[PDB]
Each structure stands twice: as C-alpha cells, then as structure tokens.
C-alpha cells in the first residue's frame, strides 16, 4: 500500500497516480508523455482547477534513481494541493490561477533498479553500443553546453552525458513536452538530493543569467522561508560556483528555452545519511520544501 511517509516502489507510485487522479478529477488529470527505455509509462499529473489558457509551473522529481527523497516530495506535494484547496488561501489561489505539471518520476527504470538490485544506481538503464556498461546520467543529457564540461563521454562512468543530447527516451520526452508548452510554462523546478541547496543557472559555464540578481533574491527568500519551519539551512547560488561546472542540465536547458525562473533543489541532508535519508525525515523534509516551493510560486504568480 502507498504511504506518503515511506518510500514507495514504482508499482505503488504508478497505482497511486491512478488512484489520486480518480479520487480528485476536479483538481488532477493524468497523462503519459512517453515510455522509458524499459517500457514504463512516464506519467505527468496536471494539478489545478481546470480552466482555459492557464499559465503553469513545471516540476519534476526522480531524475536520479537513488535520490529517493525527491520522488517522495512530488507525491507529498500532490496530496498537499488536493487537501488544502479551498481552505488554505495561497494554495487555493495558486490552483485557481495556474496549473502545476508534476512529473513524479522521470527515471523510472533506474528507480526500479535501486529497489531490486543496487540502491546507489543513479543513471538510466539504457544499453550502450560497444560495451556491457549500462546507462546515461539524465541530468547531463540536455542540450545545454552538452558534454562540454563536468561530464564524461564514457558509458561506464556515472556522469556519462549520453551518445547525444536527448539520446535518452526519458529526457527527450521531457524536453518535447516542455518545448510543446513553452508559452504557458513560467517556471521550471527540478527536485534532487542531497546537499540542502537551491541552484539557478548556469552550471555549464560561469556566465550568469540576465536576471541573476532577481534569481539570487528569489533563492535567498525561498531558503529563508524554508528555514522558518524546522531550522534547516540551505545555501544557494549559480550552479557552476555553488556546486561545480557540469554541462547538460535540465535547469540550464529550460532557462535557455526562455523559462526565466529555473531552479534545482537539493533536499536533505548534508551527508550524514546522504541518499539513504531515513523515512523518519520524509515528513519534515517535505513540509519545509513545500514552503519554499509555495514561496516561489507566489512570486512567479505575482510577476506574470
Ligand atoms: Zn540528482
């Protein structure tokens, strides 16, 4: 059975996407935007009060298989939205005014692999020509200074950038969706772990985005907001200097498409547990993250 305070396997998350949608048709619609290398369905949930020509915020979880708290967050967010609509003023206005396209798990094949074989797997599970080595790092597979820095051209490496930008069925599916909905998408949020950071472009180069000051101000306020709940401290800034230069990331790509508000969230913790964050921290991690996501949404809405 599905639980919002436990990490759920794919079979369970999939059944949940069906159930939550069927139980809240006036706030959620589910669609599949493609298939993974191994044939799993890439679901996308459109959360919001249906209406004509609504702007939207795109949010994904599960790019990297082992970052289990990421997958948990997308699920938590959906419940929060359906339960509080009509009661909490901010969420009510958010869902009335815009739609949140929530992609609960992008790298489903890798996620299944972490449950069945290797908990520390991070890449996709596609085969590579000329080698037994499996997988591509999806966050190094986008057309953003593709494979020019901080990425490997070797299939056996954990940071393999792929045979070409969008070589993976999963990243092509996401890029296609975003490209087909650019007019309505106002912000792009991608959830990962761990490190407790809010990063903005650019990661593939030390250059700064045109709206760098605004993004810094927004990230700074979002981390402040996040800390009000349990005291969790996040750092923030451009990817290249905050983490290190790494090309082919979805955040940089989305930004270069024209999406001015593009952020990568690195959830708890700082390394004590790393990727194996205990289930006992799911609730607090998700609750404080909600505050930052809602803060950003409120800002984006008032800046349309
Ligand atoms: Zn990651």
Curated annotation (Swiss-Prot):
Major localisation: secreted
Record-level GO BP terms: proteolysis
Binding site for Zn(2+): 64, 67, 192
Keyword Metal-binding: yes
Cystine pairs: 61-74, 133-156, 147-161
Substrates-to-products reaction catalysed: Preferential release of a C-terminal lysine or arginine amino acid
Gene Ontology MF terms: metallocarboxypeptidase activity; zinc ion binding
Keyword tRNA processing listed: no
Gene Ontology cellular-component terms listed: cytoplasmic vesicle; extracellular space
Entry keyword set: Carboxypeptidase, Cytoplasmic vesicle, Disulfide bond, Hydrolase, Metal-binding, Metalloprotease, Protease, Secreted, Signal, Zinc, Zymogen
Catalytic residues as annotated in Swiss-Prot or TrEMBL: 266
Name under which the protein is recorded: Carboxypeptidase B
Species per Swiss-Prot/TrEMBL record: Sus scrofa (Pig)
Organismal lineage: Eukaryota, Metazoa, Chordata, Craniata, Vertebrata
Gene name tied to this protein: CPB1
Parent-protein residues present: 113 to 416 of 416
